[PDB]
Amino acid sequence: IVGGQECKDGECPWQALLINEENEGFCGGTILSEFYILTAAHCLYQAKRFKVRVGDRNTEQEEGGEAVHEVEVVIKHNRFTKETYDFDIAVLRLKTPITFRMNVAPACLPERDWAESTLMTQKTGIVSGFGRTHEKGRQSTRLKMLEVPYVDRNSCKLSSSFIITQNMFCAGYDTKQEDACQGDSGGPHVTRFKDTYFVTGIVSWGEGCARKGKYGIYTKVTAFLKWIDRSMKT
Amino acid sequence: VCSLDNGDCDQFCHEEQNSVVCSCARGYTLADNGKACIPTGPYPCGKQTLE
Numbered sequence: 001i002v003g004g005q006e007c008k009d010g011e012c013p014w015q016a017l018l019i020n021e022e023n024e025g026f027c028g029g030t031i032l033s034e035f036y037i038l039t040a041a042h043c044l045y046q047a048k049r050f051k052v053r054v055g056d057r058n059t060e061q062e063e064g065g066e067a068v069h070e071v072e073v074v075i076k077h078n079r080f081t082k083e084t085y086d087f088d089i090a091v092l093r094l095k096t097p098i099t100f101r102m103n104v105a106p107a108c109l110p111e112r113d114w115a116e117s118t119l120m121t122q123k124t125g126i127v128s129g130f131g132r133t134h135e136k137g138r139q140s141t142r143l144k145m146l147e148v149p150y151v152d153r154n155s156c157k158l159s160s161s162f163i164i165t166q167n168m169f170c171a172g173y174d175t176k177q178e179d180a181c182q183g184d185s186g187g188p189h190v191t192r193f194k195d196t197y198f199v200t201g202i203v204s205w206g207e208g209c210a211r212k213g214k215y216g217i218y219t220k221v222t223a224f225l226k227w228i229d230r231s232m233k234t
Numbered sequence: 235v236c237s238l239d240n241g242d243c244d245q246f247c248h249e250e251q252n253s254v255v256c257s258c259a260r261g262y263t264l265a266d267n268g269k270a271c272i273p274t275g276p277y278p279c280g281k282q283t284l285e
């Protein structure tokens with residue numbers, strides 16, 4: 001996360017962190033239930049074998065509330081590809097059930113038609129993660145969150161050097177220096193409606209981080225709502 | 235009707251037979267008034283957690 005602010009205690013309870021054998025975080029994720037975590041497909045082969053940590057706000061201090069969970073199954077979308085990063089979505093079923101509590105709770109899964117007409121039309125969404133605070137800097141030990149405006153597809157496709165499928169969407173600013181960055185990938189993009197946050201995107205990619213004329217690219221969750229229900233067994 | 239104040243629904247709004255029908259996400263129960271969404275557990279999805 002470049003810019004924005006640190007997440008106040010309990011404000012990003014649905015944030016999940018993918019850890020490698022170095023016990024470090026490389027990609028984020030979003031809690032959907034006790035057994036499920038939503039992430040990005042391109043993260044899966046970015047650590048070979050990994051684990052999911054929840055309820056972590058500070059990676060420096062052992063605080064006293066985190067938790068670790070192993071993945072029992074990896075569900076990568078069949079049409080996923082590294083060339084276009086299209087279908088960059090995946091679900092992870094843990095081996096043991098996440099027990100909800102402070103800083104640990106799931107984001108809501110919304111209904112397709114409604115989400116498209118009402119959540120995607122809101123002015124902004126909320127992105128979070130333990131990603132880089134600068135384009136080529138180091139990751140943040142502190143969990144951050146940033147409010148990013150929705151950008152219409154045409155401006156999106158145009159501002160992009162790469163193809164923007166209908167499975168992705170733009171969010172962020174054109175020149176204002178705020179954006180998601182390496183490390184946030186797979187993390188949550190939720191949208192608030194009447195005090196309830198719903199899952200709306202998955203940090204996917206971007207040409208650099210918060211450059212000019214570029215936005216953050218996210219996996220459009222509304223286009224995979226049925227897929228997710230399937231993946232989680234109804 | 236869903237296009238004005240979300241058909242007064244707390245969450246999902248749908249126009250059926252020329253009328254509004256509200257619904258809620260798992261973990262919530264549609265209120266008696268057919269509008270509001272009542273959380274059923276202590277850690278309902280979408281709600282920032284308090285101490």
Ligand SMILES: CN(C)Cc1nccn1-c1ccc(-c2ccc3c(C(N)=O)nn(-c4ccc5onc(N)c5c4)c3c2F)c(F)c1
Pocket residue numbers: 082083084085132134135136162163179180181182183184185203204205206207208209210215216217
């Ligand atoms: C070469 N490809 C195969 C071509 C291709 N075709 C389709 C898509 N791509 C494609 C393009 C660019 C990247 C890329 C490269 C570098 C970075 C960095 C860095 N800090 O150096 N940080 N991020 C980064 C991460 C997460 C982000 O979230 N929001 C953000 N702005 C944001 C930014 C990066 C990238 F996304 C990518 F991974 C895939």
